[PDB]
Design a protein around this ligand. Structure first.
Ligand SMILES: Nc1ncnc2c1ncn2[C@@H]1O[C@H](COP(=O)(O)OP(=O)(O)NP(=O)(O)O)[C@@H](O)[C@H]1O
Lengths: 325, 96, 317, 621
């Protein structure tokens, strides 16, 4: 029947040339034009037929992004293949907008199944890069998959750390505990960092380790932040608010705001509304947690209009959050 | 009225459809109202949501199908997915 | 076969036995042992016959005559047999298999039926002889060493480690100490009361020896009782001093490269007439004669197509 | 003494019965455990007049629907010699027939065909008791029973097996009475006459030679000379060769020639087997697909299809020579475990539900099985993946033979060595990559793997408690859509496979290298071990109900298929109690959940135990 249409590699590389896409609108537009150009330049006649409806209907374009790319990629020369590989590397690295990065990750995952084999990215078939980007875009299942591929290629304590982080973000505490058990079995010489117990949610052990590290070394921003996170999780409002008071008196403004994010919860716990106001003021205005903290403040001063405004802003931010997850 | 949480139990799709709005339409006022509704109805336990509620085939076959036979399959699958939706007649023309 | 004072025997899964000269490492002749692989190879004190243990049967060949057929064949046992022993005069034979029964046999008669049977709870494995030749020390899969008196049936048993299969048995020529190993790789030793005709053969425990981690499956004492060599499934063997039981010796065939590792278990050992030289099996289709003091390669007996299992090695002037 | 103890038991039991009845009425649905409690008290101490009176009051008060959950136990005691207990069971079954006869007809239909005279009479009595309101249902159910017996095993397979076994009895056992007794009913199979086109075809094809051989058999009876029997067996061997050649050709069965009645059936009021629930509309049978696929297995199980009146289609497997009553009982036990895991919140979160399929035994040796869709047996999965990768299917076993061509004769440690080499030289990563490829995307794949690991843990550990055996890759299935593991054979139970002379297994369950690799990268210690901890916690917390179910198992002669049998049942129940309590390994000691789970995982993963198993068991896989 019909033959395979000849791919114009020039337009393929031109479409992938996202050198001057910056904003979210720019990247979404680039994705749209990319998918449409892929359908137009695809060798399979059926895809190029679908192109018109894709142009009239963007979800149509999205649905066949993978198949169109597969056709084009199978139609390319090895050198042109490598050039396209570099271009997609740049596209992944350029910006972590959710939609474009998710589409590219889906492309890579799709081509993993294909008999041709995954995309030969720079060194590791994209495992490192794809895992990093998937973690950035909260597509945590892909992150876990690629991190496990890293593990198969060889386990390291950093790999275990990231594996625990992903599993925790993937709401799998038992798998995380399994990773800890494996680390102890095979890496017992390595003292388990407090961050690991922090992610595993054995807050008691994390707090004990942080107390030890404090005895070794004080005034370390990471160590203090982790210890007070453990305190918040354990609900130790007293000790949390104390340490918050001293460090707030003594800590730099950026770390001060990061700490205040939950020193506000400490103030709730003890009801010290003045410290609550101080910490909330430290927290940025355009922040979901900060917005809610300012709302509860305003309602403690009975400023109902300000509380409603804070609720609206926090609900906008939470709308973004839901659209993400 | 206080008709909280029970809407999920009686009407499972009620939950999912709400989330669909956060994906479907773009008006900030409507989305904010959707968030307030979701809050008022309560953060339902995910297991309770699953109890209330109770491409893939394309990829599975792709694992077996050759590329030449693969492309028309996805083409027609997506075309017909668009086609069945009766709200897309002006698209149905290009679909046919 | 007995032309050379020193005679070496070897066997594997290829259903072919082979013979060798120790010092020169020169093959003397091959022998056919089909219908089963070779578990235990032993030479009678007279060195006129060799016994090879297989499945359901034990087959004997002659040394004085070259290219004979199986001179004797014992059958009847319903399971695999890996244990061999003879009385110093070459009259009695002692065997034991996975069928949980150890059997006595008459070599200088047509008593094709077992003289006696001794049953134990679990499958039986390699057995060894108290130098007084009136007591057998038996290892089984339950982990229970069984001391059975041939004459008065005075029977005792001891489990040193909870429910772990033990595969080894040997007692020093002086009868002063006994030793064994198990799957865990630990090595266990005991002291023997100086009673020849006392018939009680009381034992005394001795400290555990974690010789290896992998499966430790062999145990032999030197003719002079100076040394105790144990093979182990980490493709290694370790020799300990009888006087102190402190380890200064190692016999490893590890390739060094991690990918090539797991090459083949160290499957047997046999001391020279002075403890100087050790001839040991290896499931890399090989057997090797090394010097104990140096623990270095001196000879290898190649020729096998399939992995080696056991060896028989005797020294005489 | 004995009478005083009996009085003590009665005065502690009557309150027990009354309290259980009130609790059952209060629970309204999550009362399977209590239902078994009251059944235990009934079948043990029911005969005492006061206990029976309390039982009658409870039966009057209790809602009838509950009893559905335990119809299999009730009919298992249908022929109880104790007259009072039997009378009360008869009244209860009559009421159940009056209200929900669909839930009751099928096991009762079996009981009618029971060779036991007491069971036969009781079943017929109860059947005529429901007939007054369900004549059409009873007639249709009995006709289905007879016709599905006809379809399940055809005269071809009946005669193949009869001649094979009889020849074994002669040339192997020489027990004249053996073969002649075996063949006599098979001769009655034609002397009753054919009733279908396939039966008539078999008659015209072979029944002439069969009749001649039976004449020779009668000649041997009257005379006893070896000549007549020799001619009889020459004819038998001839027809045996012919039918054996035919059998591979019968790759399917058309209903029109096999059982016209089933094809004629339509718009029946009979519920689809094993799909009736009083809280749902009855799914009535209006179809029997004319085609039936026969699987090439030695038992030659048929694949049947029905159409539900609701507008949904159902598939079934139909097996003969298997006492699927044990399978039904095991499936009820798994249902009990599903209720247990749904009740405990910790397990409730993680979806530890055991996958189960409806089992409808419709004879003492033949029955039905719910066909679970989208399930690929593990052996098929591995074979398909290796064929796609062009890896030789038995590559591991081939390597094992390559070092040790006489593996089966090796001692234990030699076997361990060769097996360890075979494992090491082979990647053994087939199942993980397979679950990866079958899945559409990592998001779906992760849910599949989580469900797979948790289901494998749950069912493995429950199988250890049950003593399930021969867990070879043909008896494990993966659900493509969900990934849950599914076990599809329970012929061996209670460590029976661990005692047989032919390759006695020595592993409590299947946890081979490939399944572990299919888990997360840190396989055993993560999802699987924690899930096993939770499952043993649940099952030891409520060990009494499981013990009662397994008592219902053992005290019938099924597993042994009288004092010796009672001793064996007592020992099996004692072992199960040890498993539930922790005294399995060190009887003197009691092992906590983590300790026992770790010991089990060590035993099931240890190469020493794995190597001992049948090569066809695929321990290396
Ligand atoms: N309950 C079930 N659900 C779905 N498929 C099933 C079920 N039972 C059996 N099958 C399928 O049908 C096949 C029948 O083989 P099997 O279950 O082994 O039958 P058998 O009569 O026990 N034969 P064998 O065990 O090989 O002697 C299985 O391998 C599955 O493919």
């Amino acid at each position: 029947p019909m033959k395979k249409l000849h791919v114009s590699t020039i337009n393929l590389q031109k479409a992938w040339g996202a050198a001057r896409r910056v904003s979210k609108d720019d990247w979404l537009e680039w994705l749209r034009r990319l998918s449409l150009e892929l359908l137009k330049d695809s060798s399979s006649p059926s895809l190029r037929s679908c192109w018109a409806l894709a142009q009239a209907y963007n979800p149509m374009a999205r649905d066949l992004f993978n198949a169109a790319f597969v056709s084009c990629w199978s139609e390319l020369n090895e050198d042109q293949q490598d050039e396209l590989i570099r271009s997609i590397e740049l596209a992944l690295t350029s910006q972590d907008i959710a939609e474009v990065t998710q589409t590219l990750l889906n492309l890579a995952e799709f081509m993993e199944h294909s008999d041709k084999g995954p995309l030969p990215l720079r060194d590791d078939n994209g495992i490192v890069l794809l895992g990093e980007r998937a973690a950035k875009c909260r597509a945590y299942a892909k992150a876990l998959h690629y991190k496990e591929l890293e593990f198969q290629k060889g386990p390291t304590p950093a790999i275990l750390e990231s594996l625990i982080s992903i599993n925790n973000k993937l709401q799998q505490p038992e798998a995380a505990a399994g990773v800890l058990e494996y680390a102890m079995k095979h890496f017992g010489e390595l003292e388990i960092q407090a961050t690991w117990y922090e992610k595993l949610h054995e807050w008691e052990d994390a707090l004990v380790a942080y107390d030890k590290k404090m005895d070794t070394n004080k005034d370390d921003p990471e160590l203090m932040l982790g210890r007070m996170r453990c305190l918040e999780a354990l609900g130790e409002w007293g000790q949390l608010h104390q340490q918050c008071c001293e460090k707030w008196t003594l800590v730099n403004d950026e770390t001060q705001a990061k700490m205040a994010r939950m020193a506000a919860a400490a103030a709730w716990g003890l009801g010290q509304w003045d410290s609550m106001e101080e910490y909330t003021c430290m927290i940025p205005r355009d922040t979901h947690d900060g917005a809610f903290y300012r709302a509860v403040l305003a309602l403690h001063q009975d400023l109902f209009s300000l509380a409603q405004q804070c609720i609206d802003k926090a609900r906008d931010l939470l709308d973004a959050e839901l659209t993400a997850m | 009225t206080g008709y909280v949480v029970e809407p999920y139990r009686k009407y499972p799709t009620l939950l999912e459809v709400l989330l669909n709005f956060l994906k479907t339409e773009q008006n900030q006022g409507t989305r904010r109202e959707a968030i307030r509704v979701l809050g008022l109805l309560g953060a339902l336990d995910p297991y309770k949501h699953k109890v209330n509620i109770g491409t893939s085939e394309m990829l599975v076959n792709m694992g077996n199908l050759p590329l030449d036979e693969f492309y028309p399959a996805v083409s027609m699958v997506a075309l017909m997915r668009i086609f069945r939706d009766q709200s897309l007649s002006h698209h149905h023309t290009m679909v046919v | 076969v007995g032309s050379d004072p020193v005679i070496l025997a070897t066997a594997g899964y290829d259903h072919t036995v082979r013979f060798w000269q120790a010092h020169s490492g020169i093959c003397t002749r091959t022998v056919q042992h089909q219908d089963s692989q070779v578990n235990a190879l032993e030479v009678t004190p007279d060195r006129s016959m060799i016994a090879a243990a297989g499945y359901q049967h034990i087959r004997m060949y002659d040394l004085n005559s070259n290219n004979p057929n199986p001179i004797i064949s014992y059958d009847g046992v319903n399971k695999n047999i890996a244990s061999v022993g003879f009385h110093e005069d070459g009259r009695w034979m002692y065997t034991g298999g996975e069928d949980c029964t150890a059997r006595i046999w008459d070599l200088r008669s047509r008593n094709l039926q077992c003289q006696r049977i001794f049953q134990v709870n679990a499958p039986i494995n390699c057995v060894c002889l108290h130098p007084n030749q009136a007591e057998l020390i038996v290892g089984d899969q339950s982990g229970a060493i069984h001391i059975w008196d041939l004459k008065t049936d005075h029977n005792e048993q001891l489990i040193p480690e909870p429910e772990v299969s033990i595969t080894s048995a040997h007692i020093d020529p002086d009868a002063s100490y006994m030793a064994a190993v198990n799957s865990t790789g630990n090595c266990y030793v005991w002291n023997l009361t100086g009673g020849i005709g006392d018939e009680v053969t009381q034992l005394i425990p001795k400290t555990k020896i974690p010789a290896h981690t992998r499966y430790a499956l062999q145990c032999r004492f030197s003719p002079d009782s100076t040394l105790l060599a144990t093979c182990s499934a980490d493709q290694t063997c370790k020799i300990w001093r009888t006087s102190n039981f402190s380890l200064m010796t190692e016999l490893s065939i590890k390739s060094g490269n991690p990918g090539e590792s797991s090459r083949g278990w160290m499957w047997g050992c046999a001391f020279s007439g002075d403890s100087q030289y050790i001839v040991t099996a290896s499931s890399d289709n090989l057997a090797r004669l090394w010097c104990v003091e140096t623990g270095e390669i001196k000879r290898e007996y190649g020729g096998h197509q399939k992995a080696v299992v056991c060896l028989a090695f005797n020294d005489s002037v | 003494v004995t009478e005083d103890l009996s009085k003590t038991l009665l005065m502690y039991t009557v309150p027990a019965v009354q309290g259980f009845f009130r609790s059952i009425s209060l629970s309204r649905g999550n009362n399977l455990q209590d239902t078994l409690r009251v059944l235990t008290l009934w079948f043990d101490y029911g005969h005492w007049p006061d206990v029976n009176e309390a039982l009658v009051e409870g039966v009057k008060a209790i809602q009838i629907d509950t009893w559905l959950q335990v119809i299999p136990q009730l009919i298992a005691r249908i022929d109880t010699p104790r007259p009072l207990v039997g009378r009360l069971i008869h009244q209860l079954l009559t009421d159940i027939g009056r209200y929900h006869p669909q839930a009751l007809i099928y096991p009762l239909t079996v009981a009618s065909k029971s060779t036991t005279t007491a069971r036969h009479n009781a079943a017929n009595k109860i059947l005529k008791n429901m007939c007054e309101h369900s004549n059409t249902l009873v007639q249709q159910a009995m006709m289905v029973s007879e016709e599905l017996i006809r379809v399940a095993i055809l005269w071809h397979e009946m005669w193949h097996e009869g001649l094979e076994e009889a020849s074994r009895l002669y040339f192997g056992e020489r027990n004249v009475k053996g073969m002649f007794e075996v063949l006599e009913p098979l001769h009655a199979m034609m002397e009753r006459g054919p009733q279908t086109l396939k039966e008539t075809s078999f008659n015209q094809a072979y029944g002439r030679d069969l009749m001649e051989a039976q004449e020779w058999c009668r000649k041997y009876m009257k005379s006893g000379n070896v000549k007549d029997l020799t001619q009889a067996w020459d004819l038998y061997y001839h027809v045996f060769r012919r039918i054996s050649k035919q059998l591979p050709q019968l790759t399917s069965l058309e209903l029109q020639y096999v059982s016209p009645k089933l094809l004629m059936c339509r718009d029946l009021e009979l519920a689809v087997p094993g799909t009736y629930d009083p809280n749902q509309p009855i799914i009535r049978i209006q179809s029997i697909a004319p085609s039936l696929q026969v699987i090439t297995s030695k038992q030659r199980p048929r694949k049947l299809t029905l159409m539900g009146s609701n507008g949904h289609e159902f598939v079934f497997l139909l097996k003969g020579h298997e006492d699927l009553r044990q399978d039904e009982r095991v499936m009820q036990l798994f249902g009990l475990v599903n209720t247990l895991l749904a009740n405990d919140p910790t397990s409730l979160r993680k979806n530890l539900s055991i996958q189960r399929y409806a089992v409808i035994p419709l004879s003492t040796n033949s029955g039905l099985i719910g066909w679970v869709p989208h399930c690929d047996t593990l052996h098929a999965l591995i074979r398909d993946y290796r064929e796609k990768k062009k890896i030789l299917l038995n590559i591991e076993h081939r390597i094992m033979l390559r070092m040790a061509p006489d593996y089966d004769h090796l001692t234990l440690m030699q076997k361990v060595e060769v097996f360890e080499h075979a494992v090491n030289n082979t990647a053994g990563d087939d199942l993980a990559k397979l679950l990866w490829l079958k899945s559409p995307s990592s998001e779906v794949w992760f849910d599949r793997r989580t469900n797979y690991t948790r289901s494998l843990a749950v069912m493995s550990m429950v199988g250890y408690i049950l003593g399930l055996g021969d867990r070879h890759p043909s008896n494990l299935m993966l659900d493509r859509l969900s990934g849950k593991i599914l076990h599809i054979d329970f012929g061996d139970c209670f460590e029976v496979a661990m005692t047989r002379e032919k390759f006695p297994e020595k592993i409590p369950f299947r946890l081979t290298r490939m399944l572990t690799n299919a888990m997360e990268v840190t396989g055993l210690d993560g999802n699987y071990r924690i899930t096993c901890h939770t499952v043993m916690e649940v099952l030891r917390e409520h060990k009494d109900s499981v013990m009662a179910v397994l008592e219902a198992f053992v005290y019938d002669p099924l597993l042994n298929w009288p004092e010796a049998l009672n001793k064996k049942a007592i020992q099996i129940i004692n072992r199960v109690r040890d498993k539930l309590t922790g005294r399995d390994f060190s009887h003197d000691d009691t092992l906590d959940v983590p300790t026992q789970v770790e010991l089990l995982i060590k035993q099931a993963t240890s190469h020493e135990n794995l190597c001992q198993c049948y090569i066809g068991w695929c321990p290396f896989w």
